[PDB]
Amino acid sequence: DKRFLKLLRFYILLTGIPVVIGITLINVFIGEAELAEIPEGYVPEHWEYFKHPISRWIARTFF
Amino acid sequence: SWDKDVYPEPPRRTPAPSPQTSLPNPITYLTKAFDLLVDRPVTLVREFIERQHAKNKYYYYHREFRRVPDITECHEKDVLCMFEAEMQWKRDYKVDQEIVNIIQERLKACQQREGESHRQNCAKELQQFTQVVKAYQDRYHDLGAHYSARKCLAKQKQRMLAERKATKEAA
Amino acid sequence: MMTGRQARAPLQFLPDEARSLPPPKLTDPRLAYIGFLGYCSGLIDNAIRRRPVLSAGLHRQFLYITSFVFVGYYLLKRQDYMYAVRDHDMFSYIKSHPEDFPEKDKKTYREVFEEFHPVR
Amino acid sequence: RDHWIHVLVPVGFVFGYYLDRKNDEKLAAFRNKSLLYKRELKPQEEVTWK
Amino acid sequence: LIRWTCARSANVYPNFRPNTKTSLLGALFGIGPLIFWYYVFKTDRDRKEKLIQEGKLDRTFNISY
Amino acid sequence: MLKYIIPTMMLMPLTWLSKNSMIWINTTLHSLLISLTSLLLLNQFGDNSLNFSLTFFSDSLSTPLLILTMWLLPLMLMASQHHLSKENLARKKLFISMLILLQLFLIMTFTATELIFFYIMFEATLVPTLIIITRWGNQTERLNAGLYFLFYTLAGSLPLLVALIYIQNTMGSLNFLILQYWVQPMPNSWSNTFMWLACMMAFMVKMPLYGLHLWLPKAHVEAPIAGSMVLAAILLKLGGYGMMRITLLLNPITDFMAYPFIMLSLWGMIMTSSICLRQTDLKSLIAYSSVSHMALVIVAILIQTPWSYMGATALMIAHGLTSSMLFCLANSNYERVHSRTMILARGLQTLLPLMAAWWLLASLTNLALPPSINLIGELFVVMSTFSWSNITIILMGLNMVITALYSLYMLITTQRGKHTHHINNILPSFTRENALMSLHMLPLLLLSLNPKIILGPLY
Amino acid sequence: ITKDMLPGPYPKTPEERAAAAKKYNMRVEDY
Amino acid sequence: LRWQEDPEPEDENLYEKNPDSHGYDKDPAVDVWNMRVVFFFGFSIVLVLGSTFVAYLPDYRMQEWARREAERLVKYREAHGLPLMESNCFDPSKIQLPED
Amino acid sequence: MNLFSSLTLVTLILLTMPIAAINFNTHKFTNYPLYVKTTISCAFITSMIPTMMFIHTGQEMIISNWHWLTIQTLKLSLSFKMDFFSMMFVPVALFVTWSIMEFSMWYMHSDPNINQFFKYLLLFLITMLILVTANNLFQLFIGWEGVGIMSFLLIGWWYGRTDANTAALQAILYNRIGDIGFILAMAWFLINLNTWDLQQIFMLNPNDSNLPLMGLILAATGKSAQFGLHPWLPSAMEGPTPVSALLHSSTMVVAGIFLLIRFYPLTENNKFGQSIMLCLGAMTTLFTAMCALTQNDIKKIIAFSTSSQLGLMMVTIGINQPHLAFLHICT
Ligand SMILES: CCCCCCCCCCCCCCCCCC(=O)OC[C@H](COP(=O)([O-])OCC(O)COP(=O)([O-])OC[C@@H](COC(=O)CCCCCCCCCCCCCCCCC)OC(=O)CCCCCCCCCCCCCCCCC)OC(=O)CCCCCCCCCCCCCCCCC
Ligand SMILES: CCCCCCCCCCCCCCCCCC(=O)OC[C@H](COP(=O)([O-])OC[C@H](O)COP(=O)([O-])OC[C@H](COC(=O)CCCCCCCCCCCCCCCCC)OC(=O)CCCCCCCCCCCCCCCCC)OC(=O)CCCCCCCCCCCCCCCCC
Ligand SMILES: CCCCCCCCCCCCCCCCCC(=O)OC[C@H](COP(=O)([O-])OCC[N+](C)(C)C)OC(=O)CCCCCCCCCCCCCCCCC
Ligand SMILES: CCCCCCCCCCCCCCCCCC(=O)OC[C@H](COP(=O)([O-])OCC[N+](C)(C)C)OC(=O)CCCCCCCCCCCCCCCCC
Ligand SMILES: CCCCCCCCCCCCCCCCCC(=O)OC[C@H](COP(=O)([O-])OCC[N+](C)(C)C)OC(=O)CCCCCCCCCCCCCCCCC
């Protein structure tokens, strides 16, 4: 049981700590977008309607 | 922040501290301790993060749906028109849901803010809430889980027949 | 049903008006599925005689695949021909009989009264 | 390849993604024709979605 | 234990005889409560629908359903 | 949807060309990759459903059932690889092929744009399930259980075929997207009464309805563990999915055709929970618990309010995860004591403490502990049935009391008390077993954080 | 476990009653 | 007598020949690599990256859009004295009633 | 504003930190019960500051910090009501729980699962402060069912004992019978007032509140051991002594009383509900104190004592004196 709990915590943290650190790096350096009105004649991209950078990456790459 | 018109707040009136006793209150010392130990480092880290945001600015936009023809000027069983009308109706339904949510937020915020005299001091928010719930209930209640623009139009036609009959029989 | 159509010219697998129709591509998913059936017939043929299933008789597996694709190509040509015949006869019968197919006066939902049944 | 069996399911997903994106081209009869999303084309652009 | 569980589940129906006692207990305990709750909920919903279509049931703030 | 159908078919050469010691690991790995890929279906919109092709689409109802289905395959491979360890290699590959093929049928069952394609896939899901039960089931009763499982479903579904072909001849189409706009009201007549029965009784058997549930505590018990997992987690929810599609067409006749079936399910959730209070078979206790939980989903579909559909799809996903974990816990004790009798192995918390923690959490999700999505679905169904009639709160509350009673009775009976003395082959919990329990429970708990992706098309 | 150690139908003859009482491991007079 | 049948084989213990058994296989290297495949590709990939992926869904079913749009519409029709919602979903001018 | 809300949430997050500590462990701890006792002492210290600056002004706020879900008109948020009731019950419960845990480090010392016991006791405290600080009925239901499940886990602590398992299943039975009325109240408020938030309940202020108050009286009968649903509390003495002392004297069993005090703007306008609460509380405080006169087990006498005092609390709710009832809880 202790070996299972050690392996469970290890394989969660193995990618959880890079995901948490990467999200912190994104939210500090890259960071959240700003709500602006659409400029005249400009048609935005479909992924440019979203606020957080990871949401923009998901809507651009996959969706 | 947010727009103060859609989420209204009456202006704050805090009283000046007028202490009668001589013993120093712990709250001012804990407030200065909070300001020195907590609020200034939080403000410094937030200013650092806001500088990093200001290094690379970019924008997201509010998606503007232009108004398409609604269900009444769509032909019967014309899926290309009534699909657009149905999508328009569903977006309007979800927006009206969020309008009722905004007015509930105003009402509950008023009740907490006014405190003990909330029954007198929140009559306008209660009136706005009763009006918007009356409109929402006449518009979308009893449609069912398979709701559509056809169901809502049939409910509106039944209500308008009832209102026309009641106005006709009153004369 | 359509047995009087192909009675003036009997036992023609593909008539001369079938050539006015575009043939199935050789990358048709139907024809590729028939080729998969040929590969499955090759695998069952290696299995029932206790040969090694994937390895033995690659000439035989390939003749299974080839023969099913070869038959199924002409089967798909006849399929597309008979459905084209069905649509052609449908449209010519609608054209010859306008009194039996009136163009429907379509009303919009502002005039259409549907009874509302509440879910409560 | 020594590990050639570990590219059956991923290449299957790449092939299914390719066939979905190919079928989206055959379903393009209302591209830039819907009453909700029709618009004038931007320069250096011939289709609004692929 | 195996004998007990096989008596409790697997041997019940081969030792069943449809007779007076079992049929009256199967009708009373099987369709009795169904008929009972049917007329209860039908009476309650006919009453609620009659009050709703007369505007008598107070339904002011009811918009979640 | 072809980007999920093609890798599921590529799992067949992946399981037949694998090395003889690698056929579990490769299928587990690549089915986990397919389950990772399943999350692209969360591209949902508030107005439009994610409409792929003429054949496939996915709204917010089919999407959680798809992600649960593609997640269930690696867990079935983990659960079923220990008791099929001494199996022939060819029969082991046939078992894995039946699991992969059942997933292949299900993922294009839920995405069927047209209803007769839904019917073909829906009744195609019988055949791998029947082969799994009647071939890799353990006791003698698997053949009779396969008979009941086959011949309740086909007896219910062959009128459904005539009903769907009738709608095809009348409306001109069985496309669900077209029938969202060409739906006509179904008035009161005897013809439309039997139309309603033909459209609904197949799914009433598959849920199962009370009184027609007699295929279930033999098919779910006499199956192996992968069969029990798929039957409890997906194959009961095919019925609720078909109901939520097909009740588009059955208005307003459902508003009085629903009353006998609402009575059957509101009384069946009391009676099957009472049956769970007196079960000696642990696996049959979980089977009748599944009947008791699906009775609420039947009531929620038949009252057809938005809160009821939201609670019904949340309760379907929650019950899939919870019942699959309860069957896996039952298997984890059956692989040690070789008996499904619940009173035999007692006091197991003294021997297996972390496995008893998994028993505790699955019994808490079974009794709908907030804020689990079990309680979310349970609670929304109770809200909507209260708005339906105010007297249904008596039956819902009495069901919740009996549900807590049999859940914690199961926990106390298997885990608490003095341990059984004459049983000495209680091994420690393997890493496979605890990993199976955690891969059930941890998504079920993480879905409490962001529960909006399991609340259906009308969240 | 086998067939003649499983429960059966209702005993009618006294030798069937004695065989069942032997089966359930108890006295014939107490069965 | 009764027919020719093998006796019931004893249930094997994975911990007798392998005290480090993860319970996947009796071959220890296959067992450890099945453990790593299960743990990595379930927890380290699907659970972690899917919790991140669901956590950052791009406005799932446009609820945030609908709140922002409703704020815009309420901010409009408060300034113009319009009621916040009509009891008629559709304009009564574009509806023909059945006469009586 | 900034000090009040911050120390409010720091109290609850500080109480959740040893749960992360006991879950993220590899070693045998350097005295984890001392760690949880020190944590609850410091949480008492942290909770004293918003209490003092409530005693100064009367400062109240709602912290609706996390939007959780929106069911078409029901925006469910993680919402914390920092009112008179939270400000006077959180430091009392933390001070009592701090003394109960320093008692537990001595009483439960020879127990080899002492870390699990302190984990379970802190989980009870977390669920109880979820209950008493909640602003909507869903989060209050989370704390409600949470203290019910931790009641199960702490009554059946010695799980080899048959009577402990039996009394724990008994307590779950009576509390789910009370939960019938709790979910009746939630269903009524959702259908007739479109809310689970206390604010919209108090501002809409329904007049035909007979049935939801009957549901709330049933919930308090299940939770606070009133007559008809009382016998789980004397059976609940089967657990360890600090379980009894914390949960089944002072902290858990006042939750139905706290539920009926929490709805005081609705019970003040319903004389029928006040009469029901008055008769039920007087029945309970008669019957259980009458049972206590000839008992021989000391923990049964004190359990009938606390159920008699719960009957007295239900009496003083019934006489339209809810703040005296809450004062009697904290006393
Ligand atoms: C932490 C590591 C933990 C272990 C690692 C492994 C974890 C497990 C594996 C996880 C794998 C991934 C899982 C999926 C989730 C992914 C993340 C996600 O979706 O996050 C969602 C959500 C949104 O993230 P986002 O969308 O990226 O941000 C949007 C913003 O626009 C963006 O906001 P922003 O840009 O404005 O902010 C940027 C932010 C970066 O963003 C983040 O950090 C957020 C992302 C991290 C998420 C991590 C989640 C892990 C799980 C957390 C919970 C369990 C933890 C363990 C137990 C803890 C105790 C309980 O920057 C900072 O954090 C820096 C500021 C730090 C302030 C504190 C220090 C100030 C003073 C310093 C003084 C010294 C210097 C002074 C002088 C300096 C001079 C230069 O993030 C969070 O929820 C973050 C967690 C904290 C939330 C608040 C915590 C307190 C709440 C209390 C009240 C509510 C609860 C009450 C309960 C009480 C009891 C009943
Ligand atoms: C997206 C980022 C998310 C980050 C945050 C994650 C949020 C929670 C996720 C799930 C947490 C539970 C899983 C662990 C427990 C199960 C295994 C176990 O027994 O471990 C014991 C073991 C320590 O015990 P041990 O002594 O060594 O051995 C066990 C003993 O032999 C015997 O064991 P025992 O009986 O002594 O101890 C078992 C004990 C027994 O205690 C109980 O069973 C009492 C619990 C029920 C009553 C109290 C809670 C009531 C509800 C209130 C809380 C929720 C709402 C709070 C918000 C405010 C109100 C609205 O249970 C616990 O201690 C569980 C603590 C957490 C309780 C959560 C609720 C579970 C109750 C059932 C469902 C309730 C509704 C759903 C709630 C979902 C909330 C997210 O724990 C570990 O070693 C931890 C392993 C790693 C756990 C990772 C969990 C998250 C994994 C997610 C991966 C992907 C996302 C990345 C984030 C990763 C963050 C780390
Ligand atoms: C799980 C086991 C039991 C399953 C039960 C399944 C449902 C029970 C009822 C099924 C009725 C048969 C299918 C009806 C399909 C309706 C299609 C349609 O157009 O209907 C309108 C049509 C109307 O005729 P029409 O369509 O030609 O005319 C046009 C419509 N009007 C009349 C308005 C002009 O109905 C029928 O023609 C007859 C419908 C009833 C048929 C009764 C025969 C079957 C009796 C019940 C058998 C149940 C299973 C028994 C065996 C169980 C196993 C041993
Ligand atoms: C999905 C349908 C099929 C079902 C089965 C699926 C199986 C396959 C699994 C695939 C991967 C998993 C998919 C679902 C993932 C769900 C999780 C998820 O994404 O969450 C996102 C949620 C989304 O929340 P959110 O919506 O507020 O996110 C904000 C949105 N953004 C980030 C864009 C700004 O993430 C969080 O909530 C993160 C919060 C921080 C971490 C958790 C902190 C709280 C922990 C407890 C604190 C203490 C409380 C007191 C109690 C103490 C203990 C008792
Ligand atoms: C030790 C780890 C802690 C973090 C350390 C590292 C960070 C250092 C300090 C900085 C803090 C992090 C940055 C700021 C935090 C994020 C701010 C933000 O906007 O986040 C987005 C949001 C804030 O809410 P929101 O309203 O912006 O978004 C909600 C998302 N939508 C709108 C799509 C629904 O999410 C969070 O902050 C997530 C944290 C949640 C905390 C509570 C968890 C509850 C767990 C139980 C769940 C079940 C409850 C059910 C009942 C509820 C009541 C009905």
Side-chain angles (χ1 to χ4, degrees), chain A residues 52 55, chain F residues 35 39 63-65 67-68 71 317 321 443 446-447 449-450 452-454, chain H residues 46-47 50-52 54-57 64, chain I residues 13 16 19 66-67 123 126 130:
Chain A
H52 196 274
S55 298
Chain F
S35 181
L39 298 172
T63 295
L65 297 166
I67 298 171
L68 180 63
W71 177 249
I317 299 299
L321 287 169
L446 287 173
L447 284 171
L449 297 175
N450 195 359
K452 65 181 179 289
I453 60 168
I454 50 97
Chain H
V46 175
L47 265 74
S51 299
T52 305
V54 174
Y56 292 100
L57 287 174
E64 294 182 354
Chain I
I13 290 298
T16 59
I19 302 298
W66 184 55
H67 179 203
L123 282 174
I126 291 169
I130 287 167

Side-chain angles (χ1 to χ4, degrees), chain F residues 38 131 222 226 398 426:
Chain F
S38 63
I131 290 165
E222 297 296 326
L398 199 147
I426 301 296

Side-chain angles (χ1 to χ4, degrees), chain F residues 292-343:
Chain F
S292 177
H293 288 293
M294 291 293 105
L296 280 84
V297 181
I298 296 170
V299 181
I301 298 166
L302 289 172
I303 64 174
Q304 60 179 355
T305 60
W307 284 78
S308 69
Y309 275 6
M310 286 183 274
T313 181
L315 203 152
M316 282 193 287
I317 299 299
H319 179 266
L321 287 169
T322 303
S323 66
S324 176
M325 190 172 173
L326 289 174
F327 280 114
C328 289
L329 287 163
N331 191 21
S332 67
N333 293 128
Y334 181 76
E335 291 179 352
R336 290 182 177 92
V337 300
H338 298 285
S339 176
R340 296 189 299 270
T341 303
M342 184 175 67
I343 206 68

Side-chain angles (χ1 to χ4, degrees), chain B residues 25-27 30-31 34 39 93-94 97-98 100-101 104-105 107-108 111-112 116 118-119 122-123 126 129 136 147, chain I residues 2-3 6 49 52-53 56 60-62 70 72-75 193-195 197 199-200 202-205 264 268-269:
Chain B
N25 48 0
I27 301 163
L30 290 167
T31 306
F34 184 77
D39 199 0
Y93 175 55
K94 189 71 177 177
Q97 287 182 357
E98 295 295 327
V100 179
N101 284 321
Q104 289 179 359
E105 286 172 350
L107 185 64
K108 294 182 290 185
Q111 198 273 332
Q112 174 56 246
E116 188 65 32
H118 63 90
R119 186 178 293 115
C122 297
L126 184 65
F129 177 70
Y136 189 88
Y147 58 88
Chain I
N2 54 2
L3 182 65
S6 294
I49 300 103
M52 287 186 287
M53 65 190 296
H56 191 274
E60 295 178 352
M61 61 182 66
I62 291 170
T70 301
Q72 292 184 357
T73 43
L74 185 67
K75 182 178 183 293
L193 269 63
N194 199 17
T195 182
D197 290 325
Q199 286 73 240
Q200 182 172 350
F202 293 158
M203 188 62 212
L204 293 182
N205 195 3
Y264 75 94
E268 68 182 1
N269 295 117

Side-chain angles (χ1 to χ4, degrees), chain F residues 105-165:
Chain F
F105 287 162
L106 286 165
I107 61 172
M108 59 186 176
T109 309
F110 294 115
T111 57
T113 300
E114 189 267 335
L115 294 178
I116 212 70
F117 188 73
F118 174 74
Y119 181 75
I120 292 171
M121 295 300 110
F122 176 75
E123 296 295 318
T125 57
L126 289 180
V127 178
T129 306
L130 177 65
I131 290 165
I132 285 167
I133 295 167
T134 56
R135 180 65 178 173
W136 294 278
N138 211 164
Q139 296 298 319
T140 302
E141 290 84 5
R142 64 176 182 274
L143 299 173
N144 211 170
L147 289 178
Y148 283 107
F149 174 70
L150 190 67
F151 288 99
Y152 287 11
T153 304
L154 291 162
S157 68
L158 267 62
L160 177 64
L161 181 63
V162 182
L164 293 180
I165 299 168

